Amino acid sequence: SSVSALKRLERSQWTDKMDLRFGFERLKEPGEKTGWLINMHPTEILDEDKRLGSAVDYYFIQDDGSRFKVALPYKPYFYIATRKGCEREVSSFLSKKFQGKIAKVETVPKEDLDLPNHLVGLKRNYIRLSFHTVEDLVKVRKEISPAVKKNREQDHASDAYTALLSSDQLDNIVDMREYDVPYHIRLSIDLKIHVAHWYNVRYRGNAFPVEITRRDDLVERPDPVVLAFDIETTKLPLKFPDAETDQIMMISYMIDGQGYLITNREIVSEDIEDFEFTPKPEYEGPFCVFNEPDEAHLIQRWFEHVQETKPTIMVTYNGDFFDWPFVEARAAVHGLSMQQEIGFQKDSQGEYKAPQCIHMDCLRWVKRDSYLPVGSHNLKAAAKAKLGYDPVELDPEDMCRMATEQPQTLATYSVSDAVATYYLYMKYVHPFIFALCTIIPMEPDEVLRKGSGTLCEALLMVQAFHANIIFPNKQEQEFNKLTDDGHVLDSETYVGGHVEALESGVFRSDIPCRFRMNPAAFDFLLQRVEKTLRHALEEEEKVPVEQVTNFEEVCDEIKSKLASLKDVPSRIECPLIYHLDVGAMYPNIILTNRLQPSAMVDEATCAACDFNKPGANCQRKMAWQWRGEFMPASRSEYHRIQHQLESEKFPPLFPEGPARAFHELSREEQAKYEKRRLADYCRKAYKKIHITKVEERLTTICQRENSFYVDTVRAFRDRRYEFKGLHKVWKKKLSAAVEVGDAAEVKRCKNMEVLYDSLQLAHKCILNSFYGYVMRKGARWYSMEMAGIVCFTGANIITQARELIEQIGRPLELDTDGIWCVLPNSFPENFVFKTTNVKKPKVTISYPGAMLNIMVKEGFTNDQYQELAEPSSLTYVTRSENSIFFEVDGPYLAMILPASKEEGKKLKKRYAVFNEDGSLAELKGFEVKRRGELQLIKIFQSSVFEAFLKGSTLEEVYGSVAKVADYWLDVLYSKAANMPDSELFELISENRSMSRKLEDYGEQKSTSISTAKRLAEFLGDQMVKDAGLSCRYIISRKPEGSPVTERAIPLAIFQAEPTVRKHFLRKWLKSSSLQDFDIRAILDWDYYIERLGSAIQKIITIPAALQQVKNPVPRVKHPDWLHKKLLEKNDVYKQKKISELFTLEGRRQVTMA
Amino acid sequence: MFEARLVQGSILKKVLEALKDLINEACWDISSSGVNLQSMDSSHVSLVQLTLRSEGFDTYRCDRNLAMGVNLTSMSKILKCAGNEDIITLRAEDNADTLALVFEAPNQEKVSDYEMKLMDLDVEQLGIPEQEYSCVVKMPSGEFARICRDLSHIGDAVVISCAKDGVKFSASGELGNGNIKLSQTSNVDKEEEAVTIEMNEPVQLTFALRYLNFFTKATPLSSTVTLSMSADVPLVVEYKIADMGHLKYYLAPKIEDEEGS
Amino acid sequence: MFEARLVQGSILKKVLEALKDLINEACWDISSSGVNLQSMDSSHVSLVQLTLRSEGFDTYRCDRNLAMGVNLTSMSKILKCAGNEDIITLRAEDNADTLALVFEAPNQEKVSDYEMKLMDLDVEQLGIPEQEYSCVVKMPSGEFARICRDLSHIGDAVVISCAKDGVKFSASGELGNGNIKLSQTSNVDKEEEAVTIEMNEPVQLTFALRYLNFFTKATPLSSTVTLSMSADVPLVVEYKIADMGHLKYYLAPKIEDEEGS
Amino acid sequence: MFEARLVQGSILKKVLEALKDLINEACWDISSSGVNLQSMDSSHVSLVQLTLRSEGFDTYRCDRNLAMGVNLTSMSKILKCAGNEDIITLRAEDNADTLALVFEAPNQEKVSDYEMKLMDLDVEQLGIPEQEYSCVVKMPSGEFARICRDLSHIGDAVVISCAKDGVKFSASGELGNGNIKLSQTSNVDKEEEAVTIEMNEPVQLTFALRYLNFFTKATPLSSTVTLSMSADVPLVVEYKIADMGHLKYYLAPKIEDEEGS
DNA sequence: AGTGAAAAATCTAAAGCATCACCTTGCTG
DNA sequence: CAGCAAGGTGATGCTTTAGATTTTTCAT
Ligand code: SF4
Ligand SMILES: [Mg+2]
């Protein structure tokens, strides 16, 4: 036991001496000091009594450029649940059982979320168990977790048995919670410390603990010392770089815009010098050059450089996967331990953090949360898209060619990736995360690496502790679940947004399209447009009608437009594309509707709330569709067969293990075996075992909770709009300052401007991540009912808007975010208003937006809504709100919809809409580019999209699409006659990633497994044994009759000596009767032809066939269902009924018997 | 209190097999003169009525024109039960809500009894007068199935054209076409193989032959079928089922236009 | 050395055709008494017993008891080669890892030797009590197969009543309850097409139709199948083989508890 | 027009029913010898020969050696009018691309045309080698099929050995190896049961079990299969349609790299 | 250029159903 | 004494489905 304490104190001394050699002077002298917090880590620090005790050392930066650190010790703790009248006994027992391990145990009340009758004043009395140190916390938690688990199981069984009949002392513990919450999270929650704030640290002597306080009036943000290191190894071609044999020749890093590159001499043949690279004036850096004969002196030079610079923030691309393990092993070869010089250490999560430094990964940001496409979340595409320049790139497979002969190219590539990750960090990522952690209570390491679920978790953590709310523990995936019908479950969900594309084709402002039109809806519009504009003025602008002068004039102008449109109830007219995107329905629906997960009760649980008067006002009823897959095994049969399986014993997992009874197996393996036997039991007694059921369910949402979730999203979007207006005024100030041309005030204004942008982007992104948190599991505030209710109410609103645009035009595309429509231009959308307000003289209100606003106001405004007004006397005021705001888009120039190849099934989130000036506007969830995809269809598909806007009618625009389609089919039917072979060979590569040696899949045949066997028989087995390799391959045609997996020939057969390549292809061809060895012939030309054909079927021809237009290209066939619908549509002999064509005898319906 | 006895239950089996896949709900109605099938099909394109008259039942008795609305997509499973020659006793009541079926073995060894549940319906009824038809053709049922069901696969629509030479079936589809020509026979000895045609004027009607593929499966009822048609009027397919009654398919043609050029 | 001849191959085709669809394994017991296959199926709620007595085979002898548990689906897959008239033979050793099956034609020309990989599993002999059954009824196999396929459409369970007069099948469902009553047909000289009952006391037992539809897969095995049932006693389908032994299908009757009544 | 005349149409529909699976689309050659087609399967590894001589037909009318591009899957949906005894009529095609198909019932009172257009199917030409083969096994095809279908569903590959004491069909596959042996028949005079093997030297050939499953799906067309082989040459499977037609299966020999010996 | 696990969607072989052609057999001219 | 129609039987195309498999989607 003393050896572990010795190891921990040695580790603490190592971290302290590391901090002192990086300038973080531990505050021991008394007095005040200003600081700006940058990091947070738990580290055991001995107290005054020379006793073990945990602490967290905050790191502070000062504006003069001098850092320091401050340790603060506190007692780690959680809360446990106790039975009524059982608070003193359990505390006394656990204090006496672990004297010297528990600092303080006591009771403290916190309001819970699930307790019956809870909204009248009573509160739940929890008990804190606080320890001296975090390892004591871990030991006690793992000691108590099985005990409380079995206690929960036994009290659940006893309560169920008693309720069925009627209608280590540790007998009082019920449920222990907030166990997986980290220590520093708990401190940053309790004592209210975040990062990126200014604090007045006070420390008088060593007896008193350090005192810290927020000081937010110093809104200027200092610059931490940042450093952007990326590496490169001695990689031989067609090989994963080795973590032992390979070693660094070239790194670069960016210390606050100052470049330093470090290079070796045994690899680089001639020395390199300083240079400057500037693609944009904002990106620059002078690259200091260090040259050393040996790589040990390379790593020592880097070590002493970061010792003399002391960089608090270090940033890298794929640090936790490739950089740190490689440099750690490579330094351990030369006997320079990484846990003694820099600080970063191998943690239990597979990640790397230093006690004092920050380790950052821009890949995880640009993948998780930048909302860029999954197909291009690497660093080069982020440099092209976000930062807007083309980064310098080089093929890693042939880096040894210019390791000596062109070292300048290698140096340029290394410094270019370094400067790209550095500037991408400081421009977007750094202020974004620090704005995030203004309200997120953790260091940038974790909050960068966690998911959006954990960020929303931290937000609700903060405001739940503020509102004195005990947390729910993470949910338990309780198997053997049975619903009301008494069946076992396989998978159950809510229903998502039914994202469809009700029709497809080409829709442009210039093109005159059809309008089938119901005059009744325009009778309603003629009788309602006055109220429509009245509501638009009084609610959207929040201005009463008395402050406008030309109201009657614009109203009668709309009357004339609507009447002139009405006079012809069927048109061929030029539309405008009009994007009815209310914009993130889900937060708006939670705001309007007040979905709180605390009560959200059902029947027989609603009666607990004591203010449920017969005038039911809190009874918000909503509908959603529960779907579930179940086996038909009812309660009786499943009960019988579970006793049947209980009767005998079970095979032990351990070899030669003892027999175990039914009560001491793990739940997961017994559930797996029970499901396995029940599947082939019911397979021969019911004729069906996988039965889906999608039923309608009504759930009630309590309307008078303490309501932290709706309050957070409301006040949080409120601060979103406040910071958006602040960014607007400060961007006006920035434009004025850059027109004036001063030096320091423009710098301060730009600092505040990027501060406000990072704030508002962080707020917006976490607002549209509040839905991602509640959508899936792995969350404490996880309710299925929010996801179902919000998703189906969003679908309900979006489909009512669909049906109310169907009678006034041809709505276009239906989504779970917002409709796209095309409207007749005879509808008004803009005019010049004359209002009495001098500051705002003009009002521009789009009339269709106004009518959708008024109909959502009539239909889906919460009239049941409640609110607190005064807490002591339970004053609940009844209000009404509706923030579901259909903000609309301008008339877009073009829009193209794709269609599927299956009847009934419709595409999920696939379309394209174009920008008015002539460029592109928006894609979504679409096949422009994707990992593991052939490159031919991407370039074809982008070419078709970009060669599109010329045309005058539907036949003309489909002819212009057919022009580029005919060009591509001409250059692809020519079998690559006069086009470069390298471009095609890169164009038709297909790459599949394989890892986990060879035993992951077991015994199965896929294309990746077939290519693994092909490389196994190629030259050796070691090229298949090592994991994490992406194999590139092409489908051939010559072995006809084999399945698709066998014909996937890799490309290593294309990269050898030609004669032995011929030998390999004769081996893999199973014949030798040929004499030619052409590369173009072996390729499966028709396979790529039919893949491009399937793409153009999805994109062009089938979307054409759902319209009354000619087939666009006759050079491709069609699906048989499409061909028969096309042949059946155009016959006048099609259908004549009998009810309207011949006289019916009358009305008659059958009665009883 | 409805009772219908039938010594030849195979024809009831065959009529209720002949229209299971056509209609969804069975709008039967019993009366003193006989039982009628005033059922409206779901696709709402054609009409079929069965008329079982009192001269064919072994014991037929009714009280009034009671309408029966049992589901018929649940019906050709009870009527797949009895053998080819059992004795069928179909019973109903004026006040009880359970239809009854009783099948008796010919040698009296396997008696079966079936109950039923009842429910209401709501669907229109068509009324067609007795109008005189231009061309009437008499066809053996087996040859009628051989032509109809087997042109149903090459084609989707059929053209029934009657001229002075004879009746023809010009059915086209997605691959080709079939032009069935008929020749007159006069020196015939037996009526189940005799084809005789009543001529008034040349006519031509287009039909969805898919519905005739539904329709022709009543071949083993009566060995002779009569097809009568005029211009712009539902063609009648009439099966005279062995002096039990008759089954009529009124199928609506499709109007002719000058789409040739 | 184990050499077993049998002139007729029909019965030792149909026994394992009936055993094929219900059991996926086997535990062969070759003893001096004959051949046994006492097996459980996947559900472990029913028992199957193939008994082939030694004297039924023309030439059959043993020297020790063997318990060799090859699966049964593979055997009934491989043994379908010959016909129902072919002469069958099994050849094995005292410690054979793979047995052989010879199928000689009636003209002694088409001669086989078919072998398969063998494994072993848990071999257990559960209690087979020949308790005095309350109701034992013998019906022709064709009629019983027809009535089980008949009642499988209406519902998923049949309740069987044994009385002084005879047997009463009944099947309830959404098509309505259908009941089929058979009395003793002792008026014919053919016992193959007759039904015979022996009776102690009336009981009413409901059975699951997927398992009866798997039991009665042995349609051609016997001219008459007898089945015995008693209060809370498993149904014993006693497939009688005129050549040797028998086949036994034991099923525990499903009776619903008071969870809904 | 131009459909070959024959009083029966059983063969004309059943050969296309059997050929419909292996070959999707092919071309038909008419010459003074008769009708012929050489076709390849989907994977282009096996050849199928059908020769039906004009002198083997009733009587012959033609204009020239002509190749017709008619598909074999959708066109084999109109041939179910022509039963086992329906009569065709033949006449020269003058200038139209349409091939008809007239069907005459034995009553000689109802005709039916079937007009099909022509699409161009380009088929390669080659010369099939002919040589003296080591072993030819002539044996009735019904039992050939009922043995092949039951040794082919357990395995995936087959090895045939031609031996004097017996030709051996080793079924190499996952479940196990099983084999059939055929001696010389000496006590059966009737051709419908006897097996003969005209063989000179032993040889082993390897083939696919699925291919031998699909090849022998033309059993009602013929009565006796002959399998002809030599030292590592493609199998030649002969069916004879009376004395008027012959069909040949010519699948390539899939001999591995000295795996057999 | 992380992995890691769930999972909803997708692909493919196995089973259930009604249908089609054939074999067997009894009644009658 | 054989011709012919009725009943039973086995093969088969088709549709449904159950289990493996694949890409997605968020978790560290
Ligand atoms: S619906 Fe009303 S009464 Fe029911 S729990 Fe919610 S607030 Fe209380
Ligand atoms: Mg990197």
Numbering used by the authors:
A (entry chain A): 27 to 193, 213 to 1198
B (entry chain D), C (entry chain B), D (entry chain C): 1 to 261
What wording appears in the published article?
The high accuracy is achieved by their 3′-5′ exonuclease activity, which correct errors when they are made by the DNA polymerase (pol). The POLE1 NTD harbors both DNA polymerase and 3′-5′ proofreading exonuclease (Exo) activities and is therefore referred to as Polε-core in this study. Polε-core interacts with the ring-shaped PCNA sliding clamp to assemble the holoenzyme.
Cryo-EM imaging and associated two dimensional (2D) and three dimensional (3D) classifications and 3D reconstruction resulted in two 3D EM maps of the Polε–PCNA–DNA ternary complex at an average resolution of 3.88 Å and 3.81 Å, respectively. Atomic modeling of the two maps shows that Polε-core stably binds to the PCNA and P/T, but the POLE1-CTD and the regulator subunits POLE2-4 are invisible, similar to Polε holoenzyme in the polymerizing state. Notably, the template strand extends to the exo site in both structures, indicating that the T/P with a preexisting mismatch cannot reach the proofreading state in the Polε holoenzyme when the DNA movement is highly constrained by PCNA. Instead, the T/P junction binds just below the Exo and N-term domains in the highly positively charged main substrate chamber, thus placing the holoenzyme in a blocked state. Remarkably, we found that the tightly coupled PCNA imposes such strong constraints on Polε that a T/P with a preexisting mismatch could not insert from outside of the enzyme into the exo site.
